[PDB]
Amino acid sequence: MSREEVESLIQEVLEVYPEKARKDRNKHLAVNDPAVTQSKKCIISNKKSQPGLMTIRGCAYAGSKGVVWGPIKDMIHISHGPVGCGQYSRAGRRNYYIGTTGVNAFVTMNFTSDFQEKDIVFGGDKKLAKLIDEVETLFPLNKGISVQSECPIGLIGDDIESVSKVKGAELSKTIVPVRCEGFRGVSQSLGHHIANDAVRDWVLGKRDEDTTFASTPYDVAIIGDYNIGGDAWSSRILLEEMGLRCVAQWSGDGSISEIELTPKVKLNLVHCYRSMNYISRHMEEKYGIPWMEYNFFGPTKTIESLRAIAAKFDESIQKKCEEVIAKYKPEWEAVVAKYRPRLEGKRVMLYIGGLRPRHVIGAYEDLGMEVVGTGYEFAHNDDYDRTMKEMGDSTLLYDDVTGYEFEEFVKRIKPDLIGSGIKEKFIFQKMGIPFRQMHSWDYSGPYHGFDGFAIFARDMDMTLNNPCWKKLQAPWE
Amino acid sequence: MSREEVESLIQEVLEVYPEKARKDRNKHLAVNDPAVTQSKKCIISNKKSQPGLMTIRGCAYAGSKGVVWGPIKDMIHISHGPVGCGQYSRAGRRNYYIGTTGVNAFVTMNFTSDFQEKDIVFGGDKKLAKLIDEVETLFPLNKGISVQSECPIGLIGDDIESVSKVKGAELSKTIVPVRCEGFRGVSQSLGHHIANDAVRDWVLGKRDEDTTFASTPYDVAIIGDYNIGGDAWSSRILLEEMGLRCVAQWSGDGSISEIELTPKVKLNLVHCYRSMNYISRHMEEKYGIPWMEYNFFGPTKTIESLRAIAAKFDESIQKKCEEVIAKYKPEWEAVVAKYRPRLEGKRVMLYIGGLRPRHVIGAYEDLGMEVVGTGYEFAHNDDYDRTMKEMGDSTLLYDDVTGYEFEEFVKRIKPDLIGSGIKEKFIFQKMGIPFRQMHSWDYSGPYHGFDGFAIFARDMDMTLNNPCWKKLQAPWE
Amino acid sequence: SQQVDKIKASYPLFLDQDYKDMLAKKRDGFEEKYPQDKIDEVFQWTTTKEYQELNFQREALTVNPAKACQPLGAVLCALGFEKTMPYVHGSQGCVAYFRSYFNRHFREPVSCVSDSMTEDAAVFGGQQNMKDGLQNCKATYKPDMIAVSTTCMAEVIGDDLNAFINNSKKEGFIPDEFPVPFAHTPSFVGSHVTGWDNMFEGIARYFTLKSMDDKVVGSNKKINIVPGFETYLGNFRVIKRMLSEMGVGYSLLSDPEEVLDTPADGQFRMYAGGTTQEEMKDAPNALNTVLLQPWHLEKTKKFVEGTWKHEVPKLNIPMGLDWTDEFLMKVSEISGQPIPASLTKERGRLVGMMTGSHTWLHGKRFALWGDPDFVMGLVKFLLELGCEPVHILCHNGNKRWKKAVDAILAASPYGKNATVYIGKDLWHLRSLVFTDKPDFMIGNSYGKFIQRDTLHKGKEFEVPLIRIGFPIFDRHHLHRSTTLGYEGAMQILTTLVNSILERLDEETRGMQATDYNHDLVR
Amino acid sequence: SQQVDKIKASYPLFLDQDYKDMLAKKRDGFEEKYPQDKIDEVFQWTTTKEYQELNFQREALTVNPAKACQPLGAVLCALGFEKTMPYVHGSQGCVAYFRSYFNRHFREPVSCVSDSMTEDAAVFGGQQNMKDGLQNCKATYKPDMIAVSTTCMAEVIGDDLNAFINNSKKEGFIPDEFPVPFAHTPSFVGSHVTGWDNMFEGIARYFTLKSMDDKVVGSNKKINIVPGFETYLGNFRVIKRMLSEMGVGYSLLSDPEEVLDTPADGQFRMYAGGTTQEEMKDAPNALNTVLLQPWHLEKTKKFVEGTWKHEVPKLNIPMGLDWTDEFLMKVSEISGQPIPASLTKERGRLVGMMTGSHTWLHGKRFALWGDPDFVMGLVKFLLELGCEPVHILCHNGNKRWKKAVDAILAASPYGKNATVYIGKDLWHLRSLVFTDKPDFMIGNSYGKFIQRDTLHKGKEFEVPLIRIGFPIFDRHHLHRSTTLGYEGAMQILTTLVNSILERLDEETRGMQATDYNHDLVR
Numbered sequence A, B: 001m002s003r004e005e006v007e008s009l010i011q012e013v014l015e016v017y018p019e020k021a022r023k024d025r026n027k028h029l030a031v032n033d034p035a036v037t038q039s040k041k042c043i044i045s046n047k048k049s050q051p052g053l054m055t056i057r058g059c060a061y062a063g064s065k066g067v068v069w070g071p072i073k074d075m076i077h078i079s080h081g082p083v084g085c086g087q088y089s090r091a092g093r094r095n096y097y098i099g100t101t102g103v104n105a106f107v108t109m110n111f112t113s114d115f116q117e118k119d120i121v122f123g124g125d126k127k128l129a130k131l132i133d134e135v136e137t138l139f140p141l142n143k144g145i146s147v148q149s150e151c152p153i154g155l156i157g158d159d160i161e162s163v164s165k166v167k168g169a170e171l172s173k174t175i176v177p178v179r180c181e182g183f184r185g186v187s188q189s190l191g192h193h194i195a196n197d198a199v200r201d202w203v204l205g206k207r208d209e210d211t212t213f214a215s216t217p218y219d220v221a222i223i224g225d226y227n228i229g230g231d232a233w234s235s236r237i238l239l240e241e242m243g244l245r246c247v248a249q250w251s252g253d254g255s256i257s258e259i260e261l262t263p264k265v266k267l268n269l270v271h272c273y274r275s276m277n278y279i280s281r282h283m284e285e286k287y288g289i290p291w292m293e294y295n296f297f298g299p300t301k302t303i304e305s306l307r308a309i310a311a312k313f314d315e316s317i318q319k320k321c322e323e324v325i326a327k328y329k330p331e332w333e334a335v336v337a338k339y340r341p342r343l344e345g346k347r348v349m350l351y352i353g354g355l356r357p358r359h360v361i362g363a364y365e366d367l368g369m370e371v372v373g374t375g376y377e378f379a380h381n382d383d384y385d386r387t388m389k390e391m392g393d394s395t396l397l398y399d400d401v402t403g404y405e406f407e408e409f410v411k412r413i414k415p416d417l418i419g420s421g422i423k424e425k426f427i428f429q430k431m432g433i434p435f436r437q438m439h440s441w442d443y444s445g446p447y448h449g450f451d452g453f454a455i456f457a458r459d460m461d462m463t464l465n466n467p468c469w470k471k472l473q474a475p476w477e
Numbered sequence C, D: 001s002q003q004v005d006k007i008k009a010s011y012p013l014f015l016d017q018d019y020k021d022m023l024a025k026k027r028d029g030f031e032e033k034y035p036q037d038k039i040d041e042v043f044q045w046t047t048t049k050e051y052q053e054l055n056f057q058r059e060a061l062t063v064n065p066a067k068a069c070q071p072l073g074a075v076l077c078a079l080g081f082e083k084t085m086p087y088v089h090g091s092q093g094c095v096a097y098f099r100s101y102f103n104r105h106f107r108e109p110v111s112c113v114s115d116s117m118t119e120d121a122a123v124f125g126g127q128q129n130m131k132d133g134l135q136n137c138k139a140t141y142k143p144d145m146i147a148v149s150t151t152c153m154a155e156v157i158g159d160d161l162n163a164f165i166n167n168s169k170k171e172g173f174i175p176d177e178f179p180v181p182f183a184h185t186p187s188f189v190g191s192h193v194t195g196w197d198n199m200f201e202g203i204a205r206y207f208t209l210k211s212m213d214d215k216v217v218g219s220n221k222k223i224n225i226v227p228g229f230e231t232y233l234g235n236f237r238v239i240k241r242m243l244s245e246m247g248v249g250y251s252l253l254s255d256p257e258e259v260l261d262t263p264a265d266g267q268f269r270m271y272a273g274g275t276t277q278e279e280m281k282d283a284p285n286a287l288n289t290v291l292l293q294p295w296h297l298e299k300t301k302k303f304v305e306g307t308w309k310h311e312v313p314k315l316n317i318p319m320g321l322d323w324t325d326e327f328l329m330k331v332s333e334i335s336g337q338p339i340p341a342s343l344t345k346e347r348g349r350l351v352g353m354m355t356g357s358h359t360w361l362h363g364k365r366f367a368l369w370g371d372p373d374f375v376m377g378l379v380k381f382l383l384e385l386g387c388e389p390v391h392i393l394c395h396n397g398n399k400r401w402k403k404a405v406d407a408i409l410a411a412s413p414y415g416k417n418a419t420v421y422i423g424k425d426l427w428h429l430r431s432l433v434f435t436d437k438p439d440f441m442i443g444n445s446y447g448k449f450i451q452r453d454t455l456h457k458g459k460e461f462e463v464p465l466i467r468i469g470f471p472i473f474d475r476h477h478l479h480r481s482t483t484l485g486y487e488g489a490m491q492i493l494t495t496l497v498n499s500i501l502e503r504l505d506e507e508t509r510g511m512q513a514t515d516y517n518h519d520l521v522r
């Protein structure tokens, strides 16, 4: 499709909307131009969703409890409010960890205050304090508690900050109050920010006056990798094979101690810019620690990132970097040799959250596939700034896409594969379009690193070329 | 019912038959008189079945391969002929054993010469010699081979005896030819006899001149217990608590060495008189080993049997016998206390093979139940001689009962429980009559001994008093 | 590393020695982990009676609940109406969760909209969101009906749904004739099943309250069937099948089975089938109304009896033998149609299966949970099979319901060891299956973590999970099953007996140790 | 000893210490057992490629066959006709086994008589047995028809069935007009499926051969359906259901589904339902005859084409997507009836289930066995699912059938690793699952012993059994299920994918070792 045809497609789709929605949605749909450096000249983002259009977005509690805090494995996170939020988000995100669940780790458990009407009318602060005592009794090996506020907490005027201060002092325990009520912001994104500020204000500084950790010049932290299907582990192994020492992982398979140790590292390696740039900027300002973005999707980006990271240290790290690259070269070349012939030329459309819609593009290109459209649920313009040079000319970009827009775009563009989420998956399977979950990896993965590229390739081939897709039309029709 | 009513029931049921079958079946149906000792004047047995009347009987191959030889665990038994017999009889009988199946034990495997037409036409003796070499190669820890003849072997004139001699000599291995073709005899019973003669002729004498086995005055053998559900183990434990040494078990969990050592024992304890009395009589005549019949069903018979067995030895054994009785007294008394109130007065009809139709009566009576009818597939008149005194006056007796007869008797007598085999079970459950398998124990058991009585009582209660039997009539009918 | 012809995913990739070594260093270096001995000691403690007593003294903490929030049930109810869009007035995060929860259980598309109230709406209320939301929804997704429920934000701030909807029509955002039933569905009251009840009464009210003058009971010669919160497609289908078998005229009010099972034929159907608006308008002319799950249809009951003047029969959920019998007999009496031979035969086939399997089922002990009507029907059927319900948990049950189940238990010898729990969660149940261990659990996918915990104590302590209920996320296509009627009873029975036999085969598979009991025939 | 309130059956009774000690003394004292090191050494050897080569060099020994003998199939065929008593001329031991075998699979009564030939018949023949047996059977069990097959005794001695029956009628043991079709069914030729074919062709000949003069193809506007040896009740039902759904007139020839599923209502029905004699007599007037399992209906096909002049279409067994499609398209072409919308939707739902489960099924490796048509349909469907059939065993298959299955495999990339074996048994298969391990076995209850053997080598070598086939003795009520059509394809798919997910859950249940992958959602 040409630049003008993609523009016509946008305008034709927008015809269904009432004027107010049409005017707003027009600003969130664009034809890509890789030359542009300020994306706000082509597309607007991080604005309120239009009511009743079936956005795919979640809320700030999702961004804070579900995304940033919930993976931290040796703390207990309280879903504070009525029973729904904690139940719908119980073990839905595959932020993997090593622990003894219910004893020293708690990630897949659902701790809630289960608000009833009496708690709404009279407040939940007395309940929260009693709940904290009960947590301490029944789960003595927990190393800290967070309180993840659901919508009602701020609306009824509860003061979870005072509870946390008083109960934290009384029990000599780190208790983190998080005001991530779902009415705040417009999406998961503000949840990220609120969660980052909670880490900043209640945890990150606990060892500021402790000099007992012996650092080395090679101490790094993996920032913004939530270890989906083991992603962070297949990232960490490469970095340590390169000679670096990973002191912390934020927050996949993460522990509260390694968060407290992160101000002692020499470099913060940021994968998810969207969710963790806030705390990265804070540690630069407060501790002088530099941070850099990297990308471990596919061999081209993984090699580029290893080499960019190693250049920040010394010749010995760089020598180990080239040994890592040499070790895995036959492995990923074998993957490409097997699967690129099966995938060359295929066209894919993506819709994910705040990073992967640009970050996985290079991995698809390493298998000869072309990303013909991409977009984010809740990215900001600095994310789109980073996306336009990664996407081909005249491709289609969509911010906070509606269910109707996405189906209509797909019907016209006719992609060979779609990569998006669980609320999209079964729609497109009915239409006979191969679909891969790009949040949960469809219960597969890891996809990061060299070992993840093998799985990514196998997974795209198994779905795109599956025999099921040739049988949707009955032979008598 | 009165004797007259039962006599009238018999005559009414027989009116369906043609004259020839009527006259014959009349001789196989009787009203019990407990004073009878010459049962041949009341009921005839061990005669051919009338054609086309749906006998429950099997064949001589079942009595030899299925019953006597199959259980011997470290030998390999060849079902010699076409593929059916060995497949239908693969693992249908629960003759339990300890071993490593496929390596040193072989009970639940089906070894077969799988006759095709070329074998019928040219004979199977060359195939048998080759099969024996293949068994020796692929199962090197077997301690002997038996050849169980199916119908065609004798009909086509094969000479398995010469093969067994030549191959046994060549390979220095015990190879036992058994002429148990199913056209021989009239039931499983002749297979017992044929099987006993093969043990006698090819196995039992092998250690006649070997005096290296260290005998004791307390050595016995359990003759005729095939360890259904573990029956022989729960018998053996009591004998050894009484101070005896059980040198052999024929043939449940039995090994070929145990058999070869049996002529060194002091006393043979015969449970199944029908199937093993032949070899027991042989062993007294040749070796001077006395034998006795006993009964380990229910506490009354088990106590009497223990005391009768101990009486054959010295005072030390009789002392340990009363110690065994004292130990288990609280246990079976607790079983009776729990279950007899749930079963008192209930009436049972039995139909089984050649021993249990009289051997289990005492166990039912220990729970307050009454056996109002009983019979055998293939018993002889010396079995019925032993059955009349154990059954109440004017109860119904039936030999080689037909399907029609058994159903009509049940419809008239209306027992609370029926105990028979798998070909009977599902008929009477449609009729809404509780049913217990008295061959396979319905995949439960053991029923022998004190530990078996507890299971027996539990099982009769679970089925007789089950809620499912109150629901057969639709409430709108 | 990877072998390209034998690629390993997370399991078993991370069991490679280099990954094991790396993870050991991460733990030792930086996680400041409790010693394994202390971890073992605390785990053992959580399995004890002492820990159970502390556990059951909880008054403020809930751990691993067995319930969801009201608007989830409202959405499911709304989906069952023709060309109807579920619409939740309130915050959009809730809707992303409701859809995803159902996506994962049904493996089907689930459509639902929000009007995305933000912090502005928290201060000023959500009337503008409702006006633009209804207009946007109607124009974009072209539903014939929008059924409105609420998130807790809208309930706390006190949005007046009636007034907002009236004003959207007065100001022209949607046509005055366009149907917009609604219900208040606060997540801090009751549970998801309460939301279904609230939504259904709201739809029933919308179409009949102001039009009763011309209604005559019995004039359409049908029976209304209200299914309740129901997540087995087989249960919708078996009810319709049995009523068509008897030739009974019926009206299933809220019927999502078509839209939750559209064919994969190249086109996505947002809407399919469903109860029509005409069926609701005419429902008061039925002979009577039967409620398949009365214990969460109380508010619907009051309306049907109070306004339609239907003599709602006192029937339990038609689960098991007795209660399917009573269901069919009551339908017969109301409709005048006799129970045909085909259903008498199906009944006798169930009884035949019960006689065939009774020995393996007798005395088996179960722990179970779920919604009130489902749970009591499962308790009833288990008693009919001769099994022992031991631990019966209903997080969202009430005292009246508990009293009714205790009576069922008291009327059967198989109930002597049973205890009914209400307001307890799956962390409570975890303690119970350690201290008073049953043979199996019957429950939804969250039980898998209890099975994991029990196995960790030791194989002899493991309590396997039988998956019956909602949600089931870790097996495929079980939402197609049936639990109601004779068909549902037959399926449950087969699942129970073959779970028992599967586990026996596992315990007796060890060569020369336990395989003496590894029978070919069972 | 026993505790009265916790009674133990054999498992775990004999694990008690006193039993363990006793069994140890039994072994050491009198069993002269091979040392355990030697036992372990030989077991390990039986898992090697060296052993496999010797195993596959067998020419005379058969171990653990996967087939039965002809008269078993003649009985099952005969049971499918109205008020028909199966009657096997020969020795009574066989009938006892036929009945027990079917009893244990169906958990239903199975009627069959013998005429109990004894040793004297080896010299004098079995005519008197036939004479008295036919009179006795007819008088006692009052069948409308007696369908005669043979045991191998009768075949070796050469009993002339036609002469014996003709003399029986001549001499008044049965009326001249009483139907007594017969077939010679030698157990040393073919297998149980051959006996089904032989019995069916004998019955079809009896009723049509001498009355062809008034027959006109197409004149009754029906299609004849011959099912073959079929032991899933759902398969008879699904074919009748789909044909009725299309409004296609049909006659199912040999239909035992009623008599093998009678209700437990207080009365035993020896006969129920079944193909009528009039349906056999009228079958030549059909439009055509379709054979559901053509690879064991070759003799029936010769008679139908040669005598009735039906142009039997070339259809595979209707298993999986493509072959169910082809069956319905052929029925539509013959009957003139369109494929209705309901079946088009059911097809789309199956495709939807394939798309939903394809990621877990992809590449999964299977060993499987059974009868020829069943096996080839299972292979075809696995390919459609994107699974890899690796070891395909048909003990009773032939070289033509192998050629056809190799061609099916050659047409799909998922067949690259498959080998088809004929004449091989389950001891052969055991070797293959050790040396070239698959993920699962698909087969009958005899496969449980191969799973036991593989586990003994170690948990990482265990090959779990998925029970699809005949006989299934160690689970209850699986005979009620379905393998044909779209319905059967959905059931197989569900069984396969959930078997995969059960095993994955087992491998990831280990706390702090493998449960990082113990996902709630799959």
Ligand code: ICS
Pocket (backbone or CB within 6 Å): A063, A067, A093, A188, A226, A228, A272, A273, A274, A275, A352, A353, A354, A355, A356, A357, A438, A439, A440
């Ligand atoms: S990577 Fe992360 S859960 Fe930063 S694992 Fe997850 S495509 Fe979310 S809030 Mo799905 S830290 Fe990206 C995310 Fe955010 S899959 Fe997407 S939406 S911006």
Ligand code: ICS
Pocket (backbone or CB within 6 Å): B063, B067, B093, B188, B226, B228, B272, B274, B275, B352, B353, B354, B355, B356, B357, B438, B439, B440
């Ligand atoms: S007679 Fe008895 S149940 Fe001893 S009633 Fe039964 S043909 Fe069994 S263990 Mo069927 S005491 Fe014989 C028997 Fe054993 S019918 Fe056969 S196998 S050796």
Ligand SMILES: [Cl-]
Pocket (backbone or CB within 6 Å): A101, A108, A109, C449
């Ligand atoms: Cl958990």
Ligand SMILES: [Cl-]
Pocket (backbone or CB within 6 Å): B101, B108, B109, D449
């Ligand atoms: Cl075996």
Ligand code: NA
Pocket (backbone or CB within 6 Å): B116, B118, B119, B127
């Ligand atoms: Na041969």
